[PDB]
Coordinates of C-alpha atoms in Angstrom, one line a residue:
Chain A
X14 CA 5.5 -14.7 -4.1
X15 CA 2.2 -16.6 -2.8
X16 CA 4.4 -18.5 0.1
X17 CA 5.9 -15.0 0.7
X18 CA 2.6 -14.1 1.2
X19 CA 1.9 -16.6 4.1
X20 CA 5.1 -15.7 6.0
X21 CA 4.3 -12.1 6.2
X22 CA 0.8 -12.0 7.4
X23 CA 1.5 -15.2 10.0
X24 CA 3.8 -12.2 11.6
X25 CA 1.4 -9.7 11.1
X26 CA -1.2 -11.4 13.0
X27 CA 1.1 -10.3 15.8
X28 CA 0.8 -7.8 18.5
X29 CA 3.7 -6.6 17.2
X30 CA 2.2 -5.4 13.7
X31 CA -0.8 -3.8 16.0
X32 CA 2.1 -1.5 17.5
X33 CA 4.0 -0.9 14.3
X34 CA 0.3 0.1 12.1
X35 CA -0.5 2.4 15.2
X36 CA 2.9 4.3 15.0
X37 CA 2.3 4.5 11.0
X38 CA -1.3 5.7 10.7
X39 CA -0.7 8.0 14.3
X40 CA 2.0 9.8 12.3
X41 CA 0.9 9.1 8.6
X42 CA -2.4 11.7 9.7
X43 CA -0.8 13.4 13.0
X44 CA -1.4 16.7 11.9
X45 CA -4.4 15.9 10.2
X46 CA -3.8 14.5 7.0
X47 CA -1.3 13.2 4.6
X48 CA 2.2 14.4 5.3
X49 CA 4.6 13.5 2.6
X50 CA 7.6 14.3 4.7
X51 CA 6.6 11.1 6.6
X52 CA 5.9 9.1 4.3
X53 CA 9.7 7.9 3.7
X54 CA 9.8 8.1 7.5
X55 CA 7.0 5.8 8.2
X56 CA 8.6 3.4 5.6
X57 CA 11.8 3.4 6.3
X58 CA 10.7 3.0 10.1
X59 CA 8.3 -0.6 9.7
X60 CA 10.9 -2.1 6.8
X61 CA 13.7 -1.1 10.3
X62 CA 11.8 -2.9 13.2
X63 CA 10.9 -5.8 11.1
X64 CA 13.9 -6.2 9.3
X65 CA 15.7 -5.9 12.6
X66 CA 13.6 -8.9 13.9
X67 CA 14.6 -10.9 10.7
X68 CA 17.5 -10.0 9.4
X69 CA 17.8 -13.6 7.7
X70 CA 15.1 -12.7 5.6
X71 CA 15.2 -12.2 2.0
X72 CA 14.5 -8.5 1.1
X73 CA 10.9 -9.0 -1.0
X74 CA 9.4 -10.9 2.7
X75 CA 10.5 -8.4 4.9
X76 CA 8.9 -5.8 1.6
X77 CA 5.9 -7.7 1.9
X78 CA 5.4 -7.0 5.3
X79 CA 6.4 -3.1 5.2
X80 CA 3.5 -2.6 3.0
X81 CA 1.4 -5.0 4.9
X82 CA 1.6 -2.3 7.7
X83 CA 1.3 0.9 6.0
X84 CA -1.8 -0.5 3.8
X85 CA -3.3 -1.8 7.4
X86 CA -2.5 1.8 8.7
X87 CA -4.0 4.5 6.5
X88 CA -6.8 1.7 5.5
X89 CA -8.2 1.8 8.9
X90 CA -7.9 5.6 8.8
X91 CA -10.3 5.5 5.6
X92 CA -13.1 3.2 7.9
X93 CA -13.9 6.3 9.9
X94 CA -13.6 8.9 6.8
X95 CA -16.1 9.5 4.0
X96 CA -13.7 10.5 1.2
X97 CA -15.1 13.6 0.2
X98 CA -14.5 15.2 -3.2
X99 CA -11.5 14.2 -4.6
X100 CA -9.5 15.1 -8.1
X101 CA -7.8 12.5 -10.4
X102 CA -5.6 15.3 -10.8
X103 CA -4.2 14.1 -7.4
X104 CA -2.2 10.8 -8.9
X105 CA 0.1 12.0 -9.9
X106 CA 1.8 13.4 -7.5
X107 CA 0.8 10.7 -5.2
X108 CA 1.8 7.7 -7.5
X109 CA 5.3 10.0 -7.4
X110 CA 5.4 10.4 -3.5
X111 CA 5.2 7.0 -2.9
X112 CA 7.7 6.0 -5.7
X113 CA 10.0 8.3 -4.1
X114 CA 9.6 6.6 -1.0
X115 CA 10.6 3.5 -1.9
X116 CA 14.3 5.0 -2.4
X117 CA 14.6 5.2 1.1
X118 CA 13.9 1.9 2.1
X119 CA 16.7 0.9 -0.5
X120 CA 18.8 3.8 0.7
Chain B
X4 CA 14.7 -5.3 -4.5
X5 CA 16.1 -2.2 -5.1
X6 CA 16.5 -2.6 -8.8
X7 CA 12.9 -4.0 -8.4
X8 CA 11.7 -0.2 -7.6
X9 CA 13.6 1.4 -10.1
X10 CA 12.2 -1.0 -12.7
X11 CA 8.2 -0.4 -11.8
X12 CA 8.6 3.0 -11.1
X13 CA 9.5 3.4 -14.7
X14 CA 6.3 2.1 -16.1
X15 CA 4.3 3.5 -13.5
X16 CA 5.2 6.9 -14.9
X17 CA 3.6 6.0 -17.8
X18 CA 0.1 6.9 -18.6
X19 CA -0.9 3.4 -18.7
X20 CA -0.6 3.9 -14.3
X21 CA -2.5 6.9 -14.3
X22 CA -5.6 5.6 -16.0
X23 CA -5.6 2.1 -13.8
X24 CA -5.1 4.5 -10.6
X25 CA -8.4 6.0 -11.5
X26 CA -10.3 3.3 -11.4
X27 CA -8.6 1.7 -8.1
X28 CA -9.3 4.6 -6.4
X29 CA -12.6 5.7 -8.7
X30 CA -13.8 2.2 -7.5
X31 CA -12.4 2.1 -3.9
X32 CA -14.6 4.8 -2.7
X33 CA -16.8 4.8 -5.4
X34 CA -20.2 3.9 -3.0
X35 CA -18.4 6.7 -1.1
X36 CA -15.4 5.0 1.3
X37 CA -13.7 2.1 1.4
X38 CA -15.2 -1.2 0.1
X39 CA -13.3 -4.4 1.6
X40 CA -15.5 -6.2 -1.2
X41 CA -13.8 -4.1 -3.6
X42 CA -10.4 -4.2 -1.9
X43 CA -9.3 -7.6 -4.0
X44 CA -11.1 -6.7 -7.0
X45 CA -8.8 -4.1 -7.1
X46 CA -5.7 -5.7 -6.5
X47 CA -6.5 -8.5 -8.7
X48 CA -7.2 -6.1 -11.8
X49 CA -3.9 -3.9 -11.8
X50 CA -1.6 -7.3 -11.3
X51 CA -3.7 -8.8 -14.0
X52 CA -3.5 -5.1 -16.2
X53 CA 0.2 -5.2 -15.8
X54 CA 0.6 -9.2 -15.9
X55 CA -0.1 -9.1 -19.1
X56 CA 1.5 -6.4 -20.3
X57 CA 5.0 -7.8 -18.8
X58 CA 3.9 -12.2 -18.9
X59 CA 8.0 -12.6 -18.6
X60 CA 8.7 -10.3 -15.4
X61 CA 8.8 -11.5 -12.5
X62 CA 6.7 -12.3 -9.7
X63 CA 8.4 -9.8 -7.2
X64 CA 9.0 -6.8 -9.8
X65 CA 5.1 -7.2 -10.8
X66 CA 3.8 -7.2 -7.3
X67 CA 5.5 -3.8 -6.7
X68 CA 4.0 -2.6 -9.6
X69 CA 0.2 -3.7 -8.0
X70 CA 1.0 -2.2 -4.9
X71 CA 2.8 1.6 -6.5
X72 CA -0.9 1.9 -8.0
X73 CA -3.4 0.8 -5.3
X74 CA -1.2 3.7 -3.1
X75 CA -0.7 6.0 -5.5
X76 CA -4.8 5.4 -5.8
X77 CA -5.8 5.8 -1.9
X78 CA -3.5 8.2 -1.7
X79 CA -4.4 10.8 -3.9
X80 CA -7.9 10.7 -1.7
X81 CA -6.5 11.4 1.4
X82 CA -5.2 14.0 -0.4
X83 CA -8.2 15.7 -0.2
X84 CA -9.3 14.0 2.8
X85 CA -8.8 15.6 6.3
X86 CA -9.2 12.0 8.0
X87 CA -11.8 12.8 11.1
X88 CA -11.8 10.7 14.0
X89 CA -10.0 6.8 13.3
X90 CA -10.3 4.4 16.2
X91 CA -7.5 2.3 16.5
X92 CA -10.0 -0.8 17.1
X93 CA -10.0 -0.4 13.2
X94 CA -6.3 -1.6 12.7
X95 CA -7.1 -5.4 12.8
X96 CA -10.1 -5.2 10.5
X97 CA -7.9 -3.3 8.3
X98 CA -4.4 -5.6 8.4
X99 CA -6.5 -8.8 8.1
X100 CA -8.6 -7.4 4.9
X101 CA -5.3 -6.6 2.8
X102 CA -3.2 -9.6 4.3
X103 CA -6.7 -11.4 2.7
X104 CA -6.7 -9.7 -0.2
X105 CA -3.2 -10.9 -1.2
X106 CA -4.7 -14.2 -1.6
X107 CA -6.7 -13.0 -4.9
X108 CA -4.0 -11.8 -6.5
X109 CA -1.5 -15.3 -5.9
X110 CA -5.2 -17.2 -6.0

């Protein structure tokens, strides 16, 4: 997985991830905060443009490179925020969103 | 990779990914936001939790295991987040800390 690693983030370097990162943090907090109905969206939308771009690819790369985004996205959000008070009560229905998720990247 | 997600998800359900999730995300804004310092730390503990839980899995099934956590982590703070003003200047800061971060986990 390390060489997989150095494919994705030569491509992520790109302009092209800038764009893609933008769209998924400008709708990831659009209406102000986490929406788990766009979650899938955002997802299934990066694994779509990229994968479209390399369709040669093997399915873990282009993986590599949908998270790549959406980890670039909401952590930029997070440099600006102060993370408040926050329960650990919370993981589990966030460990399930994004477990959820996944299925529509699959399907 | 599909089979991939169906196989973490499994053992992310389990309380052994609840307590791990706490301290990413205990840890990630433990000084009180995001700590790129932290960032591989982080990433390196859960694939090394679950690496040796599961030596014989592979290196694809584990490394969707590390990332289901450090989300399901971040996550559940956003959660209670309302995610103020992000500038966009942020986005290469953040893609370039993560794509880095990789690099402790393969090394």
């Amino acid at each position: 997985v390390g060489t997989t690693v150095a494919s994705t983030t030569s491509r992520l370097s790109t302009a092209e991830a800038s764009s893609r990162i933008s769209t998924a943090a400008s709708t990831l907090v659009s209406g102000g905060y986490l929406n788990t109905a766009a979650l899938p969206s955002v997802i299934a939308d990066l694994f779509a443009q990229v994968g479209a771009s390399s369709p040669g690819v093997s399915d873990s790369e282009v993986l590599i490179q949908v998270l790549l985004e959406i980890v670039s996205s909401l952590i930029h959000i997070l440099s600006s925020s102060s993370v408040g008070q926050v329960d650990f009560s919370s993981v589990g229905s966030s460990a399930a969103a994004v477990g959820q998720s996944m299925q529509v990247v699959m399907g």
